[PDB]
Design a protein around this ligand. Structure first.
Ligand SMILES: [Mg+2]
Lengths: 44, 49, 76
RNA sequence: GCUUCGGGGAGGCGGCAAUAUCCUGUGAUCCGGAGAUUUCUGAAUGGGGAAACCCACUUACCAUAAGGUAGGUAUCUUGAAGAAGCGAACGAGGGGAAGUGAAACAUCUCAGUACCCUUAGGAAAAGACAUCAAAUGAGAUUCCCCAAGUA
RNA sequence: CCUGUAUUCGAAACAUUAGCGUUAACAUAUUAAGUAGGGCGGGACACGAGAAAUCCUGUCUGAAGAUGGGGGGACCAUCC
RNA sequence: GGGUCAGCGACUUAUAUUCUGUAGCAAGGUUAACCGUUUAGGGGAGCCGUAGGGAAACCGAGUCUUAAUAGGGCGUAGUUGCAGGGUAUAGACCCGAAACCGAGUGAUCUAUCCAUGAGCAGGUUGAAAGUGCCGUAACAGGCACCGGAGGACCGAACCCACUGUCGUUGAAAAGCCAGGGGAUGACUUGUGGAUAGGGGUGAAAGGCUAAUCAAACUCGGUGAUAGCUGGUUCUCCC
RNA sequence: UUUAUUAAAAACACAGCACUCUGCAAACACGAAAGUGGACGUAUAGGGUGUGAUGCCUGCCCGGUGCUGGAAGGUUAAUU
RNA sequence: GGGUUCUAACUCAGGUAUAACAAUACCGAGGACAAUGUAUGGUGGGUAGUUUGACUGGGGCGGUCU
């Protein structure tokens, strides 16, 4: 049956992407937190 | 509000008299429409001269 | 924002206190009003968002004194 | 990895990790100071955008073809100069819980804590008495030990 | 035995710290009124309105100004 | 309660306080922060003991109550370390909730909506309107033709999910098979967008909001609290 | 239409009916506000509530609690 | 000691000009009302935080509690 993840690149990059993170103060805090943890993947 | 009369107006006083009015009466009608000045020394000197 | 320009009055925080002494956070807002002040020195009306205390300060000090203080303060 | 200035003196071309061609007393590799180069993204700043992409305008020069080189072009503030963004803790400031404790719970506690927001400096803040004292008076601020788990 | 250790020591260049000198930017009050005090609502004071001083202020007011004013925990007088 | 083994896993730390032991000094004991060319030496501020009675003033081997000088009440070797037992404040022996609060992340599932596209084999029925002829004083009315309505009918795709068997450590964290319903509509479906947690959305089942919903998820307050349950590791003597 | 994943129904919706609100910067709803939806609509409209095609119909009670109107009197805040 | 009128505060989610929004100017309409700040009485499950005993031949109900 239909499952929860239905991938779409535009939708992924528009809800979770780098510019979407940088558009908000809270998204920039997400990025600051990911960089402080040292993640090799900042954004999808 | 203390103000110097710049002209005769009823029930308030003569020309040049320093009278007491309600602040709304002085601030909203008389001074803006040039019937009086605020009572300061720099204004009483201007009028007296 | 809801800030008086000439006096600096802005909202205060405090408590609503019930008769049973229950505390709730509340605000205390300034008595802010729009007023067009006549300025003879510029022959014009300038509209300020001002508190009642600021209007009294206009009454005592003069619109010219208050206006030069605002201009020194910044926004004009 | 390029230049230079110093150090050094026989090896060396980063590691996994060797192999090949080689470099090195005409001083290499290596170390320290300075400089040069420094793609694209990102405050990203010429416009835009699904970051690392798309699309430009303009000045000067060169080319004759469909371009190349060097620049300029964001916004805001202040009257050309600045700012922006990021990043430990500590400071100052604007907002500000609840679990919990009270063997319930509402005053109260937790606690002006967590958290959110703003903004500095090597510290910040405070600071010179419209302060205390009531003693023969003392003499700003900050921090430590007592006073005292007292009033 | 090797690298070391004790001891003695080096700098072309750049940084930093001080002292000195000089520049250019900004600053340089002159004694303090919408202030002190007061009413109402809150807040802060160890102090929960309490007999509650003192501080802060949303709201409404509002002096004296050295022959004066603030404090000394309600308040008054005296004294400091 | 434990499949077994190995490894790890539960009464701590800080401060205050009381009692006990021990050591030093002893009617006295001891310094703290600090300073110090630093375990020393200095630093006596303070603390405890040396007196109590009384709310207190006050008095003091006494004092309080009282009119009482009576009666009566209460009175007439420590200290500083070190070690140990208990207690207090802290997560306070370890593990364990359902929660509550704050700040973020989510509408690629699903709910509703907005924009913009797409789909619906095949076969039926035959509303209004219209035309003609007749008819009527005229409308009316009749008959034939014609037309193509409908949350119309039968039925594939598609959407759905009524019944049963199977499957239930599945082929599958919701399916298969055989039947079943809608199938031009209040239809289905693609792509993009909107609404966010006491909030959304809901043809309403407390449904759905990413296999999570009578208050999502993640992180944080947080080691929440747990008068409850479990566990708590060497030996011998009284 | 519905309990995705044990309930498809007599449940929800429905055309229709009634009550009631709303004169437009509407009522109402989101929002701290600005700004919105209602609606580039306007009482034959829009909201809320109940009922639920249609046919025949829909009796009595205003004491309670709401709602609407009234204000003679009683009581009654801050303030003063 | 209440009304009435006025306009000058204030309001316009009216017209005209300013490109558009907004502001501004004028006109028009309202107008010391409205509206907002402080204080205050009412209303207020719209929303929160909580309480709602124990004994008991299981609990509830009843009874009881000194
Ligand atoms: Mg689900």
């Amino acid at each position: 049956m239909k499952r929860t993840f239905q991938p779409s690149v535009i939708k992924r990059k528009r809800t979770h992407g780098f510019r979407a993170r940088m558009a908000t103060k809270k998204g920039r805090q997400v990025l600051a937190r990911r960089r402080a943890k040292g993640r090799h993947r900042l954004t999808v | 509000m203390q103000i110097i009369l710049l002209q005769r107006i009823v029930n308030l006083g003569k020309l040049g008299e320093t009278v007491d009015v309600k602040p709304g009466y002085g601030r909203n009608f008389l001074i803006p429409l040039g019937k009086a000045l605020p009572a300061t020394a720099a204004n009483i000197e201007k009028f007296e001269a | 924002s809801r800030v008086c320009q000439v006096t600096g009055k802005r909202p205060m925080v405090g408590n609503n206190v019930s008769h049973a002494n229950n505390k709730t956070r509340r605000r205390f807002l300034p008595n802010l009003h729009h007023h067009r002040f006549w300025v003879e020195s510029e022959n014009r009306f300038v509209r300020l968002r001002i508190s009642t205390k600021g209007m009294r300060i206009i009454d005592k000090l003069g619109i010219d004194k208050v206006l030069v203080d605002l201009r020194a303060q910044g926004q004009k």
